[PDB]
Amino acid sequence: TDFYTIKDAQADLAIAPLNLTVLLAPYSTTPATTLESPTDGSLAIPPGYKSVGHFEKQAGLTLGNEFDSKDIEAYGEPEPIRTIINKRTTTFDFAMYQN
């Protein structure tokens, strides 16, 4: 098998978030299970979610994933036999313009 066939890379699977928006809702609002409209598969935002408007372009939106890990090493092994991801913290930050 040739290298290109082994790679089987698709450019269409690369998705560029050309226009991004952030919507916030009070904790009493029913959470959004999905954003796909059941009737026609369009973009359906549940009621109670309100956009934060424009935000900075150069800053963008940064999604941060933080892993807390623990190394399990055995008495008869030099390297750690296993690693445990105790927790995974998710954060996101951005710079809103509107008041």
Partner: protein
């Protein structure tokens, strides 16, 4: 370094060079930070006095040497062989020799395992095949020794007398040992060398003690060492019983020495006297002092 060479002779006769030229040839090297190795531990006594406390004498303590070694090889099987051999070189009941050789000669210390060794790292030692062993050895006799000096005087005359040259080049007093053949009446020196430990330092400058008359076959070992009984008959006779509250009391003080006189009388077949003088030092190496 080539100025200092540390070796161990195990209880089984194995020879290890832990430091100096040839170190690690047997697979075991010596780690730094070894304690109570150089100076003999001595504690001083103090009694209350007008200006605080007054000096009351000193007592020497047994050595507690805590050191560490590396047992190393490229393959785990041979490392295991070396580690087993190192463990075999030690015991609690019987002692192994630890020699330090420098420009001041070779001096040895007899040491035994004070407690069980602490080997290996936190993981299994076959991974690294290069592991430390923590040794807590003890020296019951805390003084570094050299080979004792032995002198022989044999005679065929019934009455004879000789002068044994004796000298204490060490920094600590030593106790003399005599081996006297039988029969015959022996007179042995017990010179104080100025020692006032019995308030007779100069009264006993030329003190001689006459051992009891020995019957045939009653060869005696006369050791002034406080550890052992002074008179020991080889045949089990109570020779000390016929000795009337007399004893060898004085060691050979440091820096002192002379031609001590040994006299033999009433010996039909002559007699032989052997003098053993130990060479005890408080340090593995030290320049001669006088």
């Amino acid at each position: 370094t080539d100025f200092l060479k540390i070796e161990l002779i195990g209880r089984d006769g194995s020879h290890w060079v832990l430091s100096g030229p040839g170190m690690g040839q047997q697979g075991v090297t010596l780690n730094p930070n070894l304690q109570q190795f150089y100076d003999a531990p001595v504690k001083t006594l103090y009694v209350p006095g007008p200006f605080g406390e007054e000096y009351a004498g000193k007592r020497v303590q047994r050595r507690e040497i805590v050191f560490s070694v590396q047992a190393y090889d490229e393959d785990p099987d041979t490392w295991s062989t070396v580690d087993s051999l190192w463990r075999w070189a030690w015991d609690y009941d019987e002692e192994s020799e630890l020699r330090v050789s420098t420009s001041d000669g070779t001096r040895f210390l007899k040491v035994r395992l004070m407690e069980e060794p602490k080997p290996y790292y936190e993981k299994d030692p076959h991974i690294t095949a290069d592991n430390p062993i923590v040794m807590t050895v003890t020296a019951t006799f805390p003084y570094w020794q050299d080979e004792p000096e032995e002198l022989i005087w044999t005679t065929l005359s019934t009455e004879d007398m000789t002068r044994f040259p004796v000298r204490n080049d060490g920094d600590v007093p030593v106790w003399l040992k005599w081996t006297l053949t039988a029969p015959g009446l022996w007179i042995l020196p017990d010179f104080s060398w100025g020692n006032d430990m019995y308030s007779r330092g100069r009264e006993d400058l030329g003190r001689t003690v006459a051992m009891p008359e020995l019957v045939a076959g009653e060869h005696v070992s006369v050791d002034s060492d406080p550890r052992v009984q002074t008179l020991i008959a080889v045949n089990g006779m109570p020779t000390q019983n016929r000795w009337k509250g007399n004893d060898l009391l004085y060691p050979l003080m440091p820096g002192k020495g002379a031609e001590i006189p040994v006299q033999l009388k009433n010996a039909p077949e002559g007699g032989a006297c052997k003098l053993t003088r130990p060479r005890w030092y408080s340090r593995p190496w030290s320049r001669p002092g006088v």
